[PDB]
Write an enzyme that holds these catalytic residues in place. Sequence first.
Site, PDB file in Angstrom:
ATOM      1  CD  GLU A   1      19.937  -4.208 -50.361  1.00  0.00           C
ATOM      2  OE1 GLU A   1      19.453  -5.010 -51.094  1.00  0.00           O
ATOM      3  OE2 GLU A   1      20.887  -3.482 -50.770  1.00  0.00           O
TER       4      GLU A   1
ATOM      5  CG  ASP B   1      20.479  -7.658 -53.368  1.00  0.00           C
ATOM      6  OD1 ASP B   1      20.512  -8.433 -54.437  1.00  0.00           O
ATOM      7  OD2 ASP B   1      19.639  -6.817 -53.186  1.00  0.00           O
TER       8      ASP B   1
END
EC number: 3.2.1.68
Lengths: 698, 656
Positions: free
Chosen positions: A383, A346
């Site tokens: 990401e 993330d």
Amino acid sequence: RYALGGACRVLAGMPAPLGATALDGGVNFAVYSAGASAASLCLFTPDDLEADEVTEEVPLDPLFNRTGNVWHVFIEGELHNMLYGYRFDGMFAPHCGQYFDVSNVVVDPYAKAVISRGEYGVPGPGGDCWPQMAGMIPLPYSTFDWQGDLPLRYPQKDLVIYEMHLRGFTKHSSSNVEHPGTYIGAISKLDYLKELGVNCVELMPCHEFNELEYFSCSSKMNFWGYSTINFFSPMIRYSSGGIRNCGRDAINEFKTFVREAHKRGIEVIMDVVFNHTAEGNEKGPILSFRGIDNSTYYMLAPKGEFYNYSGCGNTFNCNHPVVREFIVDCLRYWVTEMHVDGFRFDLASIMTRGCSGTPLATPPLIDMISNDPILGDVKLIAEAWDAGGLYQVGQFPHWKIWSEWNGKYRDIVRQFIKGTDGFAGGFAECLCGSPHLYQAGGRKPWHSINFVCAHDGFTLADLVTYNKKYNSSNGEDNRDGENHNLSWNCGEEGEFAGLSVKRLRKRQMRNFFVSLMVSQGVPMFYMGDEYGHTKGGNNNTYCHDHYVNYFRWDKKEESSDLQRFCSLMTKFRKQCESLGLADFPTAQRLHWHGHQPGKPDWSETSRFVAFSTKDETKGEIYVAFNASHLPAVVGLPERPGYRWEPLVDTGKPAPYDFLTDDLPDRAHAVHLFSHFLNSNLYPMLSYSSIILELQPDD
Amino acid sequence: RVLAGMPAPLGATALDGGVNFAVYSAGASAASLCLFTPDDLEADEVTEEVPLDPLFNRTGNVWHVFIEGELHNMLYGYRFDGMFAPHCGQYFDVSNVVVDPYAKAVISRGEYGVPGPGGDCWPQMAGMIPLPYSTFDWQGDLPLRYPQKDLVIYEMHLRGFTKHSSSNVEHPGTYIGAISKLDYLKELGVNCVELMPCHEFNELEYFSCSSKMNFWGYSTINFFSPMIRYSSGGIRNCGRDAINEFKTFVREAHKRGIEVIMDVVFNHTAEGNEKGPILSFRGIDNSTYYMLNYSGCGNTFNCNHPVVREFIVDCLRYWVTEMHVDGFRFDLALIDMISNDPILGDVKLIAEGQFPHWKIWSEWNGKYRDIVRQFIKGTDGFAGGFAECLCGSPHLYQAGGRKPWHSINFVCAHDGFTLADLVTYNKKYNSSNGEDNRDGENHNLSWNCGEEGEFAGLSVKRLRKRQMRNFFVSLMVSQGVPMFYMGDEYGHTKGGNNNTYCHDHYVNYFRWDKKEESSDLQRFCSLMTKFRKQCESLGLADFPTAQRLHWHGHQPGKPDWSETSRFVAFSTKDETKGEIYVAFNASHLPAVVGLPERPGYRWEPLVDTGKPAPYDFLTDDLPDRAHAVHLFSHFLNSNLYPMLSYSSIILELQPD
């Protein structure tokens, strides 16, 4: 010395490996604390831990129980039924970056289980939300049978990914599972995913976290789980065992999940969050790293202010020499012992920052990860963006290994299919896997993960139902979530619209799914999109342990036509050889057409995109998208001695929107359009798409 | 016994036992009555002759003779003589025997296409003596009196109708051979049958010259006598059997609900100019009965003369009352007399906006045929004209005080291309007529739909089927009276020849063999005829008004009348189907058309000429109808319809 009434001998120990390890009829403990002046090993028991009472304490000798900055101690005996922690002393100066205190017992970062509570959403003894935690002491031997489990090792180009929340997957009563919301409740549903065409599952964060972080302040809950306490341990409140058996059961439960998934041909990819921790800023709990060596683990400013490039209070010092080793060991543990297949990072562009802040061209952490003999064989998806302003999408220190989420795909596809001008060329580029982003740097089309909806933002149904967000139940007065959703309510806002609006919405959802499944790259969609899950217009539901975040297995039955369409599209992608290409498509395989074959309209007012591609197994296929508001009769390519046969038409009523050799009257359906098909013509509604296959004319 | 005689009737009658003969002339100074025996007539011998007295046997200019006795088995003629001056306008000659203009039958030959002794194409003719009593049973009959607006006319040639061996009839090519097939016509929806000339005519008229025969029969010898060589009896019983056989036909047709319209040609006669034999008229009074060349035959019958006018009126009355004919066609067309007559006033008078009207005389709409052939094939500027044609040509008939049903609409006839040839050939092929391919219409307004001839690709053939169905839909949705020609319903072809007046060959026959192979087109045509006769809006007695008829384009209410327009659509308010929408797409490009918006209703497919049979016309007999409509429901629900190039559609508004 002796530790427990003379039964256990205390020795010097070894500074490696870090953590607690069972060997030589005893247990060796080792931790790193550069800024500590005194350290002791605290031992609890299951009964005394739920009293905030330390049953035993072993002071450590700075001479014989320390090597460099690594404290260590070896205790002989069977401690595997006890829980342990550390007490440290030293300097205390928040304005300088020191947070040592003897009154706090901290948890080892290398602990493989953290025991504080067993029930989800249930406060502690007396309305508390942050009770005392302790780590698990290992056993000399393992207690799980893998039954010969081996890595599946699918080529990444063959994957279809499914993003799942473990609790929300089966927590709704309609799931009819024995243990709803746990690792074992999920297993009973795995076959469903297998029939859906999914061969890869992406788990939302399943590392230990506190769902009651916000409960005291505002009665909210951390549903999604993007705030981690420990990185070696699984969430014990996602298991049926709970704190039973010092957490070992929970571990085995996780293992069970993974093993079962491999027997159905499904791979497991873990979502990890290394860019911050539950401890927050200077006003927050001391559970972990902060209490051991803050300056070593957290990225601070010169005056002692925490750098916050995530919005969550702190920023993990990912590139520090010790932190890199910690992270690499976490990943190798989750691969070699829990048999995980890959990871998703993330806000990945915080691992490419300096260990001060300055983005690095060749970050040391990414260097160590991608060069590892073990982590080199597993999927790594990034990401590539952060909350500070970095957008490394297409420019990421990939080392020719790392994959990446594609947000440009999302924006372009959303705007084109909703009917925006100037997006035909971008849409055509997306359908080929964005060669201009990944081919130039040496990467293949499958290094792009394509999606139009995720857990954050509108769902597939809300994307065609609401113009704007409705984040009022979040309590922020709509001051949260995305403001530019690129959505169209299809002419009337809300769920109560006319029949034409509803038919248009069904067409639009099928068009989005077709766009996903015919594109080059690895498709991905969030759980519940296959049947039209809706969140009521709320595009930020991070704090709702409510049915809006749950998989609705009853609603899945009402909309089984869309589920059939989606499963058939996944099967079709699997069969077609030309849709899972290892290299980028070439002009000798792929041709672009317009309303007339061979005449694409790339102008700014274009809203039609069509192509045809050869295929070793299907001969040749033709795909077309009409995103204009007016219908059109389109001409098909001229293929002497063959004919185009209809397969997919999103405007037709089910089951005729996808023709299979199971419909009793498929031939009659084809015959009743034969008078157009014989002329190389096909009539299309506004906002639709079609797929046809070339077959011998005999 | 020879007696004086009386002027009336101007012919032969069996009243007052005996026979009274009366003939009008203008220069017959000598006259006598010849009586032949059939065997003697075959040998060209006179067996009796009764001279007439200029005073005792003549009143004014009418010769009389009354013979007391029985002459029922005898034939007769006249030995008229007087001034002979062909260069002056007189053709009197005693040596020749003429036939009474009012004779009801002429007995020369009894086998079609078989000449007389020694190959004689012009044997001696004689008339039949009538009986004093009737011989035919009508079994009870009364005029059908259909309103002319409710007709669907079917033009047929008697011999060609059932002469092909595939007809499988007892007497192929005769009056009594077509009675069997009348039921077939009733299945097509034909309300009326129009007969090509069935008066006594010589099929071998110019057989001696060259080798050609006269097939159509547009050349009349006797105006009171049916073609005996179209009967099975031939000359049997002095031909009086033949006259009954014809009657039988009429009777049987009237028992199927079909009227009979007779094609008459009073503008020329087979006498020629001065080269052919004198059969009648020229040997009696060549001045009164001829205008001493606007017909193309060689002479005109002097329509404007009191004697000629009375003759024509009496002939028409005889046909109406003695034969029970319902109507007449006048080729290349007194008028006031016929229109004002007590009997002929109620008869359907049809003439080939300029012809005198009197609010009675219908007209063949030749402008309709030109506009409709040019719109359907695709041509610029004909959208307005086509829209006018669909409304019954108001600019021609409403302005003159007429009705839309006074216009007879057609696209094909006995002369010109057939329906299948309109979509097959671009040129005319009349080389089989032996005239250097010079005899024939040169402006056919056709189109071979791509490749010319009967050997083309599959797409060309599909387009041809579409075009034929489009022409028939055009005919059956227009205001007026539609007419078809024998064989169009199954795709009859002349092989490119647009003028077959001289071919007693399979090209002019009804190929019952082929109608069993193109039964889909026949199904479509019969269903369209059924559809017309159910709707109220398609058989209007008065011109459509703006309150019921609406014009649309690709978008409802936005018609394109410009010179580039090739699409015509309208919607009409019915009272048995609610509302109907019709559209024609003569463009070469397909199109999605938006249908009128009707809250609470939906349009349902009925006709689509682009679809394969049997789905080109949907009927309850089709078990798959509901599924077929369902598979287009996703277009239909949004008020859309896709159309191929060169196709037409018909939809009905249902309360859905």
